[PDB]
Every structure is written in C-alpha cells, then in structure tokens.
Write a protein that binds this ligand. Structure first.
Ligand SMILES: *[C@@H]1O[C@H](CO)[C@@H](O[C@@H]2O[C@H](CO)[C@@H](O)[C@H](O)[C@H]2NC(C)=O)[C@H](O)[C@H]1NC(C)=O
Ligand SMILES: *[C@@H]1O[C@H](CO)[C@@H](O[C@@H]2O[C@H](CO)[C@@H](O)[C@H](O)[C@H]2NC(C)=O)[C@H](O)[C@H]1NC(C)=O
Ligand SMILES: *[C@@H]1O[C@H](CO)[C@@H](O[C@@H]2O[C@H](CO)[C@@H](O)[C@H](O)[C@H]2NC(C)=O)[C@H](O)[C@H]1NC(C)=O
Ligand SMILES: *[C@@H]1O[C@H](CO)[C@@H](O[C@@H]2O[C@H](CO)[C@@H](O)[C@H](O)[C@H]2NC(C)=O)[C@H](O)[C@H]1NC(C)=O
Ligand SMILES: CCC(CC)[C@H](NC(C)=O)[C@@H]1[C@H](O)[C@@H](C(=O)O)C[C@H]1NC(=N)N
Ligand SMILES: CCC(CC)[C@H](NC(C)=O)[C@@H]1[C@H](O)[C@@H](C(=O)O)C[C@H]1NC(=N)N
Ligand SMILES: CCC(CC)[C@H](NC(C)=O)[C@@H]1[C@H](O)[C@@H](C(=O)O)C[C@H]1NC(=N)N
Ligand SMILES: CCC(CC)[C@H](NC(C)=O)[C@@H]1[C@H](O)[C@@H](C(=O)O)C[C@H]1NC(=N)N
Ligand SMILES: [Ca+2]
Ligand SMILES: [Ca+2]
Ligand SMILES: [Ca+2]
Ligand SMILES: [Ca+2]
Lengths: 389, 389, 389, 389
C-alpha cells in the first residue's frame, strides 16, 4: 500500500452534526455496561478506518476507582482506541501503551501511536509502530514533557508531531518531531513567538505546509499559530491576530488593544482548540472551534475564515453555528480528516466532560461535526447523561 | 468489485419463518446484558453480508433512561447496525450517525448510510459512504423531513431513496433522490397521486423499474404505490386498487366504495408496510404484509399477488399465512433481499414493539420471514418478552 | 477455493482430553456474564475453523426465563454458533435461524446450516447456505420431523444429512437428503432394518461410504447402523451386532440373546451416540462413546474397533478410557473432524447437561476429546458448575 | 508465508515501561465486568500480532468459584489468549485447550499451542497447530510433567520447547522437544549440570544458538543456564556464575562461596525468571529480571550484561532500573520478542499476582517493559487493585 498525502477536500460549505459517542449513557448503577473512564479523546483516520482514541484512567463506570479520575497524570493512565462508532468499553477497547499524554496517526501503511509517561521532572515520549515499540524522546525542560492530545500528520511516510516541555504557568517552548516508520529522524526547533505553545491541533494547509492552532496556558487568550514547512523542515510561530480570540478563558472579542503580537489580558489558563483545513483548488478554508462561554468550559461554537493569513488578520472569524449550547460542557476540541475514495472530509471533534468534581467519576463524551453539503449548521449536541445515575 | 443489479429470484413459492432477533429476552433486571432500546429496525444486504439496522434511543435495558423512549425524534437518537444474526447490544452495535429517521443500502462496492436529524421545522438528511460523511439534503416543506425506515436500492452504482416532508396529518409530497458513491446526482419529482406518501418500502420489479408500497398517514387506508423508472429517472404514484387494504387502521376489506382512486374512510393514521418482489423469468410475484387487526398494531399476515398491475387490480391479495398472531405486536414491516451465489432471496422483516406506554421502556424485536421451498407458511413468531422483568 | 473430501486421518492411536467449554462457570448470580441456555451442542469444521453449535432456548443465566428450558421444542428455540474455543454468550453468539432441531457442515467453500421448526404435526426443515435461506423439506410422517443434532458430511460439494419423522415411541423411518450449495438435489430412502432410526452420528469411512451410528428410541439398546454409498446414493441399515450395546438405557453387555438382528429388552428410550472414523492407508478405526451408567445419563466411556463389519461383529468393543466419570452428567455425544494441513483429526464431543429438574435452568457444557499421540487416555472431564449459584 | 528466523534487534540501549494489562481493575462487586482469574501469563508474537496467554482457573471476578484458585493444577485449568492489548475477560478470551502448564509460539506460518494436563503421576503434554490437535508427549519421571510458562522458539519452521518431570523438591531433569508443524520430530537430552531445571525462559542468541535462564526449585538460587545448538540439536546446561543471583529466595549477592559451579545456600524454592536477548551486529546483550526482595515475591528489577559467557562470568550484572517497586507484587517474569518490519524488539513481561491467601480470589496483572530509545529506565508499574472491592 502507498503513503498518504493530503488531498483536495470533498465538496461542502458547512459543517453538520455527525455522531455522538456518549459511553456514560450506559454507565448507570442499574445498568450492565462498562464504559471506560477517559479524557482527552481524539480521532485519527487511515484510508479505511477511523479510530477513536482517549486517555483512560484504567477504570470503568460503574466501578470502585473514581478517586483520582479528575487527575491529569498517574501510573495507570493508558492510550486506548476503538474503531470510530464503537462504544469504548472495557471489552471493545484496545490498550496501546501506558500514557498520560497522547497522539496517533496513520501514514498510509501503518499506525503510529504516541504516549508520554514518566515522572513529571523527567517524562518520556514513546512511539509504537503497529505492534512494535520503536523509539523514545526525552524531557528537555524537565517539567511535564507533553504532546498534542490529537492526531499527528503524515505525508509521503513522514509524520510530524508537536511536543512541549516547561511550566504550565510559565515558559513552555515547543518542538516538532519528524517521525518515519516509528523512528525520530529529526527535531525541528520553531522560530518566532515561542515562549508558550501547548496542545497544538495540526493539519495540512497543502503538500508544503502543516499549520497548527495551539494553546498558551499563561500569557494570552490568543492562540499561538504554527506554520511548518515540510519541504525544509522549518517552523515559525506567531499569535493569531483575529479579534475572535479562540482560548478559554478570554476577554471580550476585540478588547486586546494594540497590534497583532499584543498578548493582552485574561490570558491565564486555556483549553485545547479544534482547527481543520478545507483545501480547495484555489482557496483555503480554516475552521476553528471555541467555547460559547468566554470564561468556562461550556458550549462550543464553530468558526470559519477563507484565505488571508491568520498571523496578520485582525478581522472577525465568521460564526458558522452552535455545536454545543451554553448549558452543555464544552471541553477540548480537535480537528481530523476522514478519507473518502477521492477526497478528504474535514471534521471537528469535541470532548464533553462529565464534571461533578473530585468526589465523583470524571469522564467524557465525544461529539463529531464534519463538512457536509450546503447551507447552515442545524443542530446542537447534548450528552444526555445524569451523573447521579 | 462490481456494482450489483437486481437478479432473478431464487426458486420458491412460499415464505417460512427464518429468524427472530429479540434483544429484550436478555434485558431482565436479574440479567447481565445490555440490549439497545430501539425502533424502526430494517435489514439491508450486500454480496457477503446482511446488516440489521435500527434507530436507537441511545439507552439500554436495564437502564435509567427509559423516559422519552416512546418518542419519535430527539438529539440522542442514532442509526446503528450489527451483522444480521447478532444481538444489537451496547457493545455489538456500531453507531453510524445521529438520526431520528433512517435508511441504508449496499451498491456492490460499499455501504451508503442515510440519517435525518435537525429541528422539526428545518431537518436535514445526511449521507455517509463507508466512513466518509459525503452529502446532505434540505427540508423542502419545513415539517419533519423524513425517509424510508428501510433499505434504499442500488443498481449499476445508482442508489435511489424516498424522502418526504410535510404535515403528518396533511399534505406530505414525497421526492426521490438518486445517490451515487454517497453524493446526490439528482432529484426526481413524482407525478400522479402525490398528496401524501410516507415511509415507502421499495425494491426492484426489474432492471428498469423500482416499485414502492408506501403509507398515507392522513387520507386513506389504501397504500400509495410508486413506480420509478430508473432508465428515465421519472416516477408516478397511484393508490393500490386491491380490496385487501394494507394500512392500519383500515375499514373492512372491499368496503371502500367506487373506482380505484377512491380514498374512502378510516384512513387517518397508518403504519409502514412490508413489500418485496419475486422476479421470475416470465412472471412477477409481489409479497405484502399487513397487520391482523384492522385497527391496532397486532399480528402480521403475509399476502401475494402474481402479475397484474397494483394500480388497477381490484381483486383480493391471496392470504399466504399468519406471521404474527393477533395476540402479538405487529408494528412496522419492510422488505429486503438476501444475495445467494447466483440469485436473490426475497424476505419480509417485522418490527414487534414492546409497548407498555410512556412510563416504561419502549423497544422492539425483529422477526424475519423469507421465500424458501414449497407449500404453505407453517409457524408464527412470538417475542417471548415479559416487560415486567 | 476447492470442495473438501475426507482425507487419511492424522497419525495417532489414542484420544486425549482436549477442551472443555463450560459456559455456566460464569453464570452466577454474583457474576457479570450471560452464557446462553442451550442443549444439543455439536461441532463442525471447515478448512480454517471449527464452529461450536447448539440449540438455545433464547435465554441466559442469570435470567428470568428458566421456565420451559427443560423443554424440547417451542417457537423461541434457535440454532446458534461461536468459533470453537469462545464462550457461547448472548454477545459472542450468532443466531443462524429458528430451530428446535439442528445440523451444519462446511463443503470447502461455504457453510450449510440446517434447522427444523414448525408445529409437531407438520414441521419443516430449513436450509441456509451462508447468509441465504435456500431450501426446505416437509414432514412426511406428520410427527415431529427431526434431524441429526450433529454435523452433516460433504464430499465433492455434495452434503448428506439424516432426517427422521414418526412417533418417538413407535415407528420412525429415517431418510437422507443429498444437498448441494444449500439445495436438495435428492432424497435417499434406506433399505434393511428401517423401523426406528434417530439422531444419526455420521462420518466418512472412505470416499465411497458414509457410516452412521444412530438411536432407536423404542425397540432396542443396539444402535441402528447406516452405511450410505455416495457413488450410488443408496443406503442400507442394520443393527450393530456388538455385545457392547451403545444406547442408554441398555441391559448388561452380551445379555441380548440370539443372532445379530435380535432387538432384545431394555430398549425403550435412548440417547444420541458419538461415533468417528480413523481412516488409515489399509485399516479403519471406529471410535464410539457410551454412557458409564447402563440406565442413566451419567459418565461417558470411549470405545474402539479396528476393521471388521459392525453389522456382523459380535465381539466386544475395546474400552479405551473414561472421559466423564460416573458422578458427572453424560448426555448426547457426537463425532467431528478437525482439518489439519494435510490430514483429518477425529474427535468426540460430549454434552454435559446441568440437570436440576423443570423448576431450574436447564443447559449444558461441551467436553471435547480428540485423537492425539500414543498410549492410553489419561484424564476425565468435570463441568465444575454448582447449579445453586 | 515464510518461516521466521531471529533477526538483528531494533536499535536501543534501555528498556522503558510499555503496557500494563490489569484485568482486575474492572473486577469490582459494584462493576459490570468479567475479567478471568488466571496465573502464569506469558506473551508470544508472530509477524503481525502478539498474543497474551495465561492459564485460567475457568472462573471470573466477581464470581462464586474463588476456592481452589490459589491452586496449581486441577481438571478445569485451561490455556487461553487474547490479542495483546485486550483485557482477557470471559468474552474476549479464546480457550485453546485444557492445561495446567503452558507454552505457545508462532513459526511464521501458524501458531503452535502447548498444554500439559493429566494426573500428577502420569501427566501429558499436548500440542495444537492452529485448530488441529496434533501430537502428545508422555511423563518420563511420573511426577508432574511440566513446561516453560513462556514462549517456545521457532527457526526455519523448527520450534524448540523445554519440558521437565520430577520432584519439585528433588531431581527434575529437563528435556527439549524439537517440534515442526505441531509434531515432535526429536527429543534432545541436555548434558552438564542437569539435576534440576524448571520453567526455562528461552530465546535466540543467534541463528545457531538458543539460550535459557531457568529455575532450580531445590538446590540453588543461581539459575541453571541452557545453551542449545539448533544446528546439531544438542544442549548443555551449567549454573549462571554471576554474583547477581537471579532466583527468589536467594542469599546476599556474592555470598555463595567458591567457584562458578557451587550451589551455595538459601536455594530451596524459586521463581521463573525473565530473560531476553538483544542481538547486535557484533555484540550480544542479555537482559534479566529478578525480584527486588531477596526472599519474597515483591518488586522486579531489570539487569543487563553485554557479551561474556554467563557460565564463567563472576561479575555483577548492571542494574538497569526498578520495574516494580518493593511494595508491589513481583511474581513470574518472561522474555518475548515483538516483530517490527525489519528487526526484533526484545521485551520482559512481569506477572503481578493479587495474593490475599487461599480464602480470596487469586489472579494476576501483567506488566510489559521493552527495549526503546536511549538513556535510563524511567517509571515503575503498579497494579492499582484493591482486593477488597
Ligand atoms: C499532494 O501530492 C499528492 C501526492 O503527489 C497528490 O496526489 C496525487 O494526485 C493525482 C491526481 O490529482 C493522482 O493521479 C496521484 O496518484 C496522486 N499521487 C499520490 C502519491 O497519491 C495530491 O493531489 C496533492 N495534494 C494537494 C496538491 O493538495
Ligand atoms: C439485470 O442486469 C444485470 C446486469 O446486466 C444482469 O446480470 C448479468 O447476468 C448475466 C447472466 O444472466 C451474467 O453473465 C452477467 O455477468 C450479469 N452482469 C452483471 C453486471 O452482473 C441481470 O441478469 C439482470 N437482471 C434481471 C433481468 O432481472
Ligand atoms: C478422496 O479423494 C480426495 C479427492 O480426490 C483425495 O484428495 C487428493 O489427494 C491427493 C494426495 O493424495 C492430492 O494430490 C489431491 O490434491 C487431492 N485432491 C483433492 C481434490 O483434494 C483423498 O486422498 C481421498 N481420500 C481418501 C482416499 O481417503
Ligand atoms: C538468520 O537467518 C535469517 C534467514 O536466513 C536471516 O534473514 C535474512 O536476512 C537477509 C537480510 O540481511 C534477507 O535478505 C533475507 O530475506 C533473510 N532471509 C530470511 C529467510 O528471512 C537473518 O538475518 C539471520 N539472523 C541473524 C544472523 O541474526
Ligand atoms: C499541566 C499541563 C497541562 C497542559 C496545558 C495538562 N497536561 C498534562 C499532560 O498534564 C492538561 C491540563 O492540565 C488539563 C486541562 O487543561 O484540561 C488536562 C491536561 N492534559 C492531560 N492530562 N493529558
Ligand atoms: C410524524 C411523522 C411520522 C411518519 C408518518 C413519524 N416519523 C418521524 C420521523 O417522526 C413516525 C410515526 O410517528 C411513528 C409511528 O407511526 O410508529 C414512528 C415515527 N418514525 C420515526 N420516529 N422515525
Ligand atoms: C421426541 C423426539 C426426540 C428424539 C428421539 C427429541 N427430539 C426432538 C427434536 O424433540 C429429543 C429427546 O426428546 C430429548 C433427549 O432425548 O434428550 C432431546 C430432544 N431433542 C431436541 N429437543 N432437539
Ligand atoms: C510443583 C512444580 C512447580 C514448578 C516449580 C509448579 N508447577 C506446576 C505445573 O504445578 C509451579 C509452582 O508450584 C507455583 C509457583 O512457584 O508460583 C506455580 C506452579 N505453576 C503452575 N501452576 N503451572
Ligand atoms: Ca490562555
Ligand atoms: Ca392511512
Ligand atoms: Ca433404545
Ligand atoms: Ca532456587
């Protein structure tokens, strides 16, 4: 089989609600099912199949191991998948590797799986190519080495991946790894605005360029925006100039005074953001998602911009529709691409966390919206879970 | 692999009881299983395999989410399948897409999946070709856009599908979509008696003609009868003339006074009806199913007519046997075709709803009868479920 | 792929304990599993794979549907399988068809499935070739038409199957059906001792002859013994002459006075018996199983005879070992053949029924012994189920 | 497909934590899962896939059959597998054969499965090639005939396996079987220090030599060390000379006075030990695991030695890291090899037994560490199970 490359996108001018995976709809005390407790879900597709990934706390609902499940990192957390459309339960799932931070992607021939574990002060990125554990990468700032929580991107067999290391409250200067058949064949050190880049959501703008919309957990509600040239293996990063700030928390739209590079206020904390390309013959569409609340992880709106340059564009993104209403959880979001026979379908996935605090179970549904047809986005997504059951 | 075409039917002159799928036989409080709560099941087959589809309420029995499950449309309802012969449970099932109205069919190369969701006033038909979301179609009468709840039909790669839009109590003028590799390549606007057509059950009479037996939810207990010419992509609709009225409710057989086109009385409400062709070298068999009760969704009898013209034939259909006795639920029914090595097996499927009102769970078994051998239909089907358990 | 033929058996001179499938070891009230309630298990293999068949009461343990489960025939009973080695549970199982009497076999290219249902006075044998329902056969004595409860046997694409019809207490004159790609291409009417033949266990003695060891439910504890010539499609039946009477109940060995054809006493009732061939270059081995108790369904011993003629041989069979001790249930038993790369492995399977009467659940484990190596049979099989749990 | 041969190992200089399979994390009373009760897990891989084997007590947690589950041998114990990464539950598992001692391995074309059962005084090794039961081997010392509890090793189609027979407290003189397409084509009788060899962990040092690190259950805390020449099918055994005694219990490192062959003290009892080769172009790495406690089955450290000769090397092994801390169970350990596209990944697996005595359930998690990247081993493995739940 042949290496995959980004293709022209399938025809379409709007996203529509596609699929909800709400495994805790079957988690009642009165029920008989074992959905896995998870967070940081993402989706990645090869030629034939999409897989729904997540980071489990290796516990189920109903169950006795709720405690710790609101936590980020421990020695039990694993990267798991199911084929997309299956409920990720104890039995349907496969456990790929120990991980408290993840990524995966298909290169046309095989699956690369990425999982970070280790102690906070010296963590370790591991790479699996199919069945074989294949390579590692070491902590360079000795402070919670970390990856995308979304799909890596492969072209001509060469798979690119964002990592970062550093204080979540401070300086976290990201790197990219060029990976081929599961082995690291180079490190790319971005230039430009590089002081804090987290959890990049990356995809192909063309055969020459990968672009990522990332999270600054410390200094700004603007998303750092990566442009990675895969011909030269060089990357530059600058803040998104759009007045439609995509992070949460954030201040009012347009309120960050001054030129594109201005950090502004209300920039502490953050959330991973969805971002996907629509590649047309002579026009590029960029689709983004952000929370409906400016302050809390509630709701998710979808946004679009055709052409321009996200580094210098001060104008608003166009609100394309409400995916998750203000009354429903809107947590992490991510882009991915489904492979049709002759073209690529852009989609956004949304993690809808069931959050009842540290004294209950802590897990998530995943909602999916994809480019399809014409017109306007029509319907929002609810999880339907009562956390008391 | 090659596109499929309708073939000559396998030899046979009677249907026989084939298979019951009664997932709630494993739904007891005292039990350990998770059958999905569903309705509107149907079956569709490719060359190798049949799939058993249904519209889930995304809830299981036993479970805490019974409430709403008697309802028709909500934001949780999804199109699901299992391979035919598997119990559609939480874990065996795959979730294809968000849908409160569905259809699917195989074209010889791949599966097309159809699901309608959206608000009642502006609903949306979505199309999936394998993994890829592929096209949409918009509400044209802004009143619960709707589809077959049974298999679409593909020939030479071209897959045809009935939709309708309009008041369930009033005018609902249906359309057909010609779909190819998941994309709509034309709309067909039927002529003739077109004031209310719902939930058509369609199949091939030949390589030139698709025929459908549909439901009039407002004006008549006679079934509107579609004839769609796939060479010219044109369709005409007229009422079935048979005295053996196939809808429920209905008046006594023969009691609708006057010529073929007369609407008659007791025509308010309705039920989707099974219908399948037996294609022979020089004779066509049409098999239909209708409820044993004239008024309630109880029982299911099978009926046949060889040759003639359902638009002008006033004679009775021949009662071929009792599939479901008067004492057992007989809800929706549908036709489909199993692909043998060299010929096609016609079958009727019957949805047997467990109905205990809005304050209990609301789901369904599926019974299957197929053409096989000679003689007379021998045995009826019971679900065996006690809804108190 | 090519049609299968019986081959020379793999080397070996003894059977050994191979595999127990005891699905009710996971059926506790305190447990979380759903093993299917079943009886009449058998096993059949193609080139790649063996399937473990049984007739379910469409109920699980734990569950609310125990009542009726001791019964032989009803409208819920179905033929199911799993790949051999899997626990036949609600979810692992596939439901092939409605059946209260069954058989299956692979012809090298595809699976033929056989299931009888219908009313007692007019029952119906149904045939499925892969997915397609394909043929039927009608009741000829209008009294519980019935089949093998073990594998049919295919050669050169032609699959042979024993059926019978008649009073279980009286005259039940069996027939054979020659089936090809799921269609009956002839009926064979045996000659000879034909007054009562039930539940034949059949296999290949050579490319020319199929042989069966059957049950007489009325007149004798000797097993009727079929020899079917597949070149001429003719069959003759005579009683087994061996003093080692293989039925249960039975009188003491050797106590049936007079010549081979003598019926003797203690012949009322019966049990289906295991029987398998070991085909060697210039010697034929016949392996049989019978209960350790002469009167009750307790224990199972394995027996062998090389060469001779079972119709005229008065000598004892050689006791080869105890498969199930006197203290464990020994119910139906059956032969089958596993396909190695170049040769065929003969095996006997034993149904070990959990019998606590009509007021508890009624189901069965399956024990498997196969030809393997040299020496002497070493270990017996226990089910390990406490029916109180 | 072609026979497999040992290849050059994938690049790497350290092991890292890869994967935990902790099926009892889903075994709570309050939960809905059925993990199998097991012990003696091991892993074996073919070209495409790794399988996770174990010896079940044919019981689940939660369940009613805990009693006996601390025991070594009974008539219910079976060899089971799942694909590596799946939770071995009642439904995910396949049951290969009755066994209370096991082994498996892939030869490039098919799976060989090994299982010993029988009475203690006359036990029986059985061999399965795919589906077919294929050969047996008899007890030669009439005292619990036994095998590796880890993978056999195939080269050019020829698969080698260690067995032993004899008193666990006394003389147990092991043998090797050369097996080809499931049939024993020779016995190899080792020479040298042969008085007690148990549970050898074997792999390829090269195309010419298999090496094993075994357990002496009676006379020494030094591991007997096998070198098997596959060209000549001859084997010699001597004690490991290293001061880093790999058995448990053991005395202080270096305390066994005298030359390499000295037995020393604290040698009664034992544990099976992990051992895997790293084959380089002109250097051989040997990786071993031993318990952190000198006396109890607690913790697991990983060790390495490059080149030398384990029979004559008195020097210490290099401590490479702590896989399981002193506070966590460290029971059996084993080596295996994952097949990358062009090279072989060495790994160690560790059985982490949940031991609460004979009056609770007795089962095990499996931890996996593999060669991957550079540097130092970073993280230990905990099971996370509270046996009270
Ligand atoms: C990027 O490059 C790929 C690979 O070169 C392009 O895919 C080719 O597209 C043409 C049809 O336009 C096919 O005939 C070739 O078979 C494809 N090659 C491969 C290796 O798949 C793709 O069109 C390019 N994508 C862009 C420009 O967006
Ligand atoms: C409808 O058309 C199809 C396709 O042309 C017919 O199928 C052909 O049947 C002949 C044998 O009668 C085969 O040799 C061809 O291979 C078939 N073609 C294809 C593309 O499958 C089919 O017989 C027709 N069905 C009718 C008339 O009912
Ligand atoms: C019965 O007939 C079959 C089919 O003719 C025999 O199988 C053949 O065996 C030879 C080797 O002895 C192979 O070269 C052929 O390929 C086989 N043919 C087929 C169609 O499989 C088989 O040996 C015979 N069995 C007996 C005599 O017991
Ligand atoms: C052991 O022998 C095998 C088989 O001969 C060697 O595998 C060969 O390796 C070369 C490349 O180095 C390939 O071109 C061949 O296709 C391989 N042959 C087979 C049959 O796989 C292997 O390199 C040897 N392993 C060692 C020396 O460790
Ligand atoms: C402290 C660094 C954070 C990234 C900005 C942190 N990442 C990790 C790997 O711990 C994320 C953050 O704390 C949590 C969130 O914001 O939802 C999830 C959390 N992500 C994961 N648990 N994998
Ligand atoms: C109001 C329009 C009706 C069609 C005539 C209605 N269709 C939908 C899509 O809501 C059906 C009808 O109300 C119910 C029935 O008759 O059983 C099922 C119901 N079908 C579905 N829930 N999919
Ligand atoms: C009354 C005729 C009997 C055959 C001799 C009878 N067969 C059927 C099809 O009902 C069997 C017999 O009654 C029971 C037994 O002997 O175990 C099983 C039973 N077999 C099945 N339930 N399939
Ligand atoms: C008495 C001989 C022992 C080998 C040294 C013994 N082997 C068997 C087959 O019974 C092992 C030992 O008793 C137990 C242990 O040490 O953990 C496991 C146990 N292994 C198994 N139950 N398969
Ligand atoms: Ca921020
Ligand atoms: Ca009507
Ligand atoms: Ca008898
Ligand atoms: Ca020792």
């Amino acid at each position: 089989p042949e290496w995959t490359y980004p293709r022209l996108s399938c025809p379409g001018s709007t996203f529509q609600k596609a699929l909800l995976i709400s495994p805790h709809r079957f988690g009642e005390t009165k029920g008989n099912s074992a959905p896995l407790i998870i967070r940081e879900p993402f989706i990645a597709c090869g030629p034939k199949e999409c897989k729904h990934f997540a980071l489990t706390h290796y516990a189920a609902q109903p169950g006795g191991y709720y405690n710790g499940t609101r936590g980020d990192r421990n020695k039990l957390r694993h990267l798991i998948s199911v084929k997309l459309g299956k409920i990720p339960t104890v039995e349907n799932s496969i456990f790929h590797m120990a991980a408290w931070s993840g990524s995966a992607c298909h290169d046309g021939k095989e699956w690369t799986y990425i999982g970070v574990d280790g102690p906070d002060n010296n963590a370790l990125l591991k790479i699996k190519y199919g069945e074989a554990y294949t390579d590692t990468y070491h902590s360079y700032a000795n402070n919670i080495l970390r990856t995308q929580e979304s799909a890596c991107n492969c072209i001509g067999g060469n798979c690119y991946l964002m990592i970062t290391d550093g204080s979540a409250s401070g300086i976290s200067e990201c790197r990219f790894l060029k990976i081929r058949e599961g082995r690291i064949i180079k490190e790319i050190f971005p230039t430009g605005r590089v002081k804090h880049t987290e959890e990049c959501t990356c995809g192909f703008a063309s055969n020459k360029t990968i672009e990522c919309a990332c999270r600054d957990n410390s200094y700004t509600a603007k998303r750092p925006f990566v442009k990675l040239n895969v011909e030269t293996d060089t990357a530059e990063i600058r803040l998104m100039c759009t007045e439609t700030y995509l992070d949460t928390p954030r201040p009012d739209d347009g309120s960050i005074t001054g030129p594109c590079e201005s950090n502004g206020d209300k920039g502490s904390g953050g959330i991973k953001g969805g971002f996907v390309h629509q590649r047309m013959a002579s026009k590029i569409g960029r689709w983004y998602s952000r929370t409906m609340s400016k302050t809390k992880r509630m709701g998710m709106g979808l946004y679009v911009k055709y052409d321009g340059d996200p580094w210098t564009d001060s104008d608003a993104l166009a609100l394309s529709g409400v995916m998750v209403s203000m009354e429903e959880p809107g947590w992490y979001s991510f882009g991915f691409e489904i492979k049709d026979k002759k073209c690529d379908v852009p989609c956004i996935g949304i993690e809808m966390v069931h959050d009842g605090g540290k004294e209950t179970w802590h897990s998530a549904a995943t909602a999916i919206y994809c480019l399809m047809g014409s017109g306007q986005l029509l319907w929002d997504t609810v999880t339907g879970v009562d956390m008391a059951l």
